[PDB]
Design a protein around this ligand. Sequence first.
Ligand SMILES: [Cl-]
Length: 141
Amino acid sequence: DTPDVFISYRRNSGSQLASLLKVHLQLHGFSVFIDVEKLEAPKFEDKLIQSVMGARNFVLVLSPGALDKCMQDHDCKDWVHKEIVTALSCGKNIVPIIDGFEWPEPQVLPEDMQAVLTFNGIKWSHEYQEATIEKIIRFLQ
Ligand SMILES: [Cl-]
């Protein structure tokens, strides 16, 4: 329950890229967890997500509009928002992956996740996936 990488992603827009990152990393011997259930169940406590805390790295798939559902989510109901907050609280090495994503202004995001904009992103390249994956692995711990 302590893999190398946790992959956070938006279901409707980043499912295939998050999956491609996962199997690429597995080809290099890394263990990876990804949430494909994403049930709309409520966690009515400010609880850190266990799977994020256990993973040694936090990879964030920034597909188009991936953080849209995080805006005004001050009650922290959104899955991706809660995952990012857990990663920030635990001091995780956060590695955002950019695939046609416009970095929004910090004011439109809840206070507890605005710190995610300060991490270095890595642009994804379909033509040079192998080269991109090696760069991602260099940013891993
Ligand atoms: Cl989602």
